[model samples]
Target: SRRRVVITGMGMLSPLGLDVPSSWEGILAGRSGIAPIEHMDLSAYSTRFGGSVKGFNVEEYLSAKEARKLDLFIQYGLAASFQAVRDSGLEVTDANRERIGVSMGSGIGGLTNIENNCRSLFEQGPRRISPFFVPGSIINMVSGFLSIHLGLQGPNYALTTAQTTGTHSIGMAARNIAYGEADVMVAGGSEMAACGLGLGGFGAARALSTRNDEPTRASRPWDRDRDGFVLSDGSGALVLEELEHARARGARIYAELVGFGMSGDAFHMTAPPEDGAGAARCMKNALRDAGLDPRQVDYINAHGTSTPAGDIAEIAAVKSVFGEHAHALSMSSTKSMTGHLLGAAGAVEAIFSVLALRDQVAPPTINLDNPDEGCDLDLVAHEAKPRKIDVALSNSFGFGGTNGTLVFRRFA
Candidate 1:
């Protein structure tokens, strides 16, 4: 028999705020986290703004000596995981440590480190490169370092599925617990790619918003004037445990993770099918997995990245999957404020979805001043709205034409 899974705790470090409460508070107020890039010289780049995590101090989460050995991505993941483990109150005892797993990943891992090291190799010499370069910058180190830090001895996994990394990580972790491989799993994603190479590549692809003069309003998803997504850096983590295991430990159940589904567009490498057939099927599959009717969903945390083609495609997907019920569902893109956290987007958005149900409120999709043609659904624009959200769904689509959907509901 399959075990049930529930989210016991969540942690986040986003451009808006450092922790869950702070981030959600900023989100509820419809504040924008996007701003001019500060960590690097962007005078040459077309897109100079992003949702960079500000005032982050690694020493707060890790010892200075220990933090020096890891890249920013690993540090961010570890910090979020520490917050999640502390919040969940899951004591990692010798008896139960073996039953706790970790799944954390990065869409673009340690881009800053890689870029700087490459520059050093050419400008100075390869001998100047640090010995810790590879382990520090590699994608899997986020999961590997997290497992070591937390003493989690069960399944350990990492993914680099671009924007879908976070959602896929959490979904796979839940599956691990459901299949009896582990009773508890720490899962989510982290990213710190707001560097020169990161921004230059996306900017060259014309994938990033170039509204340097209006950084706050740049990530205007569903808005007619929106250009493209703004890159961001951060991490989000969640603690998922078996229902019975949580009950035995008297864990505070935040919400139940009911369904997870994934699909590939197969239509294009970067562009979603204009009709959104693949995305629609992904949502349908998730609903089917959850044994839910379309009308039962109360809110949707859209993967609206403010990109022209992506936004339209997602709208089409929502309409196709929900049909007449689509109009009744409140959909919003927190990315409007947080810019785009890439691999960390889904995990943070999932936390927002759970909070929406917990607080009986739907967060706003800021900067939706003028909705595009197909964005006719109620976007809860400008300000947060109070509502009884029994079930909430979150969608994530990555650059590789990959899509992932997660369903969350009140624990009652």
Candidate 2:
């Protein structure tokens, strides 16, 4: 008897929308969510645009008194997790409460909360600082809070592997389910790093786009004119359940979580090798674990963050792993429209892949007027296209040389 894990429910709060359907709709329509930064004064920063979550009201999910204590990241994470749990209809009876868990992460958590507290400590006395600062803003609070709120007595944890955090969270959660650690797990990543420190710090390092005038064209992954990724605030979540449990409950499975792989560059802090050796190894491992050949993969959700150096490297990795089949596969970066979600990128892209398999359509990478010299692939550019996607591999790479891939196959 072998145990398997499958995705039964999905949820997200992206720049394009506050829920999964809205974000997917925008992706299918090739709409851009990145826009000029409007929350704060960025007059001194080099980059003034990001994929900020629009029209988000935490009050919708939590009461005013309770919501005011948490940071934006936690609010977004809880909202997505609640939606996912509700979508799955996973009842938490006293008998089954111990068999459910949570795994949520953030690449850079609590930056906004930290920045505000730091200002309070300096301007006013240290005593004026809020006591909820540490407990409210930390990354693991998302998992911990979600568990307490839902009465989940199983494992609860969070990963902080930068951009790869979400992929790692989901992959590891699926592994736990497959190993009988839990029958159900709510897993994904959330992030809100658009504050002065976040925007100014990234802008200072030249890691963001300066296409202030045309925010839509800024995150043009693989495009020759691509500058850099547009920082975004978003979260994505999935409810993974054991195969038997899902079947017993007659749950609507979105996809089968077949394989997961992880690798490290051990080469650079923020840049991959030009040949994408780490990324290639990650994908190869996932394919091997999935018992699949290169040709079996019909689509790829690339970690194409629109950075000049990163875009070509991911393409190189695909070419290396897929070989002749690289020409046959359809690869696209939803980040081209949603911008880069950083820690939330992998989970969000994985949801997009699941939807593609569900709808048999590949979402497009917008603004790819000219692909870079090494960026050669059927990128499904500009418009969503109907296609056959039986198996899809989603890739995620982080700043600390961590790389992860998740293999999801369409459920029959």
Candidate 3:
């Protein structure tokens, strides 16, 4: 029999809060974390608001000198990862150190750093660049640094699949354990690109919400007046362990990862097919993998980024996947409050899915005023509600049509 993987620990660094408990509280209370961009100059940018991590101190997790050498994304990655490992209480002795690993990443890693270095290259000289630039800014360094810091020597790597990065990372890490690669894997994603290059580029592409006057209400997914996604930054991670291994260690299990599925639209660079066929295929794939019927899913943490196209597409995908049962299931987007955490979105959503199972409640889709036509599912709008959530599905779709689905079941 194949090894089963369960989440033993979860960590969060989001616009809402610094840890999982705080973030979950914010989510359940339907609080919006989006605000006007404050970390960078926004005078010339079209979109002025985003979800930014507030009041974070890197010195708390790393030495000041060590933190200085890394990019903000790496710092965020390490903070959540460190919290996860500590939460899991997995001892890294000589024997087990080699069997624990990390898989973390970012969507647009260190763009601000790249922008600064490029400016230095032109304004000053190439010699002005910091020597730690490459290691600090690269996508894989999140995994690299986490492993080194924790003395983990097993299957350490990162995935950079746009918004789907976190989901794919966690899913593949689970596969690693199921296939006997490692006993425990710290998996998730981190991101912080809401700066000059990140904002300007997404703004230029008309992919950001310009509802500058109403920052909190901007990310109203499935609402008739929805515009686009809000750019945001943060990190999240989970410690996944083989079931028997976790049992042997007396680890606290949050939930079991039953299945994962991936898909490519092959039709667009940024949007899914209008019919959401690719998304449908992905959900079907995951259910088949888990040997679960669609009707068993109690809630969906939708990949609902509030974009006009994406919101409808996901609703269509739900209808296609569950048909008559689509209206019976609760589907909501935490992005309505947390905004879009880019590469970190999937991991936090995955964590939220597990928490929903643990708490038996569905988090709200805040700011959803008037629901759009064809989006008739139970959108769990405005406030959280208690529900019988035994199984939950988390969805993430990235640019270039990469999609991933994760199925989580309540731990017995």
Candidate 4:
């Protein structure tokens, strides 16, 4: 028999807020996290805006010596993981450490560190690169370091699938617990790419918003004036444990991880397939995995990155997946506020979904002026809605046409 998995704790570091409550409050208040790029100088870049975690003090979360070894992205990841582990109330020790696992992903891990280290090697010579450069640049170290720090002994995995990174990590972790491989799992994603290379690289591909004058309106998902996605940096983490295991430990259950699905479109690397065919299948697979009907979902947190094609394609997928029920469901792109956290997006958005279900409130999609005709869905515009939420689905599609969907059911 298959085991049941439930979310015992959650953590986040996003532009919306540092933790869950603040993030949810910002979301419900219809506030946008996107703002003028203050992390670095953006005078030369086409896109002068980004989403960054505000007022997150690493020293408060980590020792100075420990913080020196990891990049800011990894620091955020470790911070989130620490918050999740403590919140889980699992009393992890050497005796039970072997039953714990970690699966975390970073869409583009430590880009800032890698870029700076490389520049130092070329411009200032090899002696200038920090000895910790190797440890800081690797994406997998986000999990490996956490496992070592926390003394977790189960599986440790990492992937680099752009925006789907977070969702994929959680799904794989839940699968492990559900299959009896481990009693508990720590899973999520983190990213830090707000520097010149981060901005220049995306701008060269014409994949970032160029609305330098109006930062708040830069990430207008489904809007006619939408240009491209706003780059963001942050991390999110979740603690998933077996139902009976959690109950035995008296763990606080937040929600249940019921279903997960993934698909790939062979059409293009960056562009989703025409009419959102691949995305549609992704959602269908998630619903089928959950043994639930299309009408079962009450809310949707979209992977709408504010790109013209992406917004339309994702909505088409929604219509295809939910059919007539699409009209009845409340849908919103929290990315309109948080920009696009890439690999970290799915994890953070999943947290958002669970919180929405718990709070019985739906967050609004900011800057939805001049909505697209094809992307016409009930995108909760500019105001949160209060209603009972039994189930919610979060969608995440990566740059390589990889699609992921997760279903969370409210615990009775």
Between 1 and 3, whose lDDT is larger? 3
Ranking by lDDT: 3, 2, 1, 4
> Candidate 2 lDDT (Cα, whole model)?
0.92
Model 4: per-residue Cα lDDT over 112-191, one tens digit each: 88888889889988899898888877998878998898888998888788889999999889999999999999999999
Best by lDDT: 3
CA shift of 57, model 1, Å:
1.4
Please provide, for model 1 over 347-381, each residue's C-alpha lDDT reduced to its tens digit, 9 standing for 90 to 100: 89999999999998989999999999978998998
Tens digits of lDDT, candidate 3, 99-172: 88889978988887898899999999899999999998999988898888878999989899998999999999
Instruction: Give per-model TM-scores.
Output: 0.99, 0.99, 0.99, 0.98
lDDT of each: 0.91, 0.92, 0.92, 0.88
After superposition on all CA atoms, how large is the RMSD of candidate 1? 0.8
Residue 195's lDDT in candidate 2: 93
Better of 1 and 4 by TM-score: 1
The sequence of per-residue lDDT tens digits that candidate 2 reaches over residues 57-92 is 888788988777788999999999998999888889
The count of backbone overlaps in candidate 1 is 0
- Cα shift from native, residue 261, model 3 (Å): 0.5
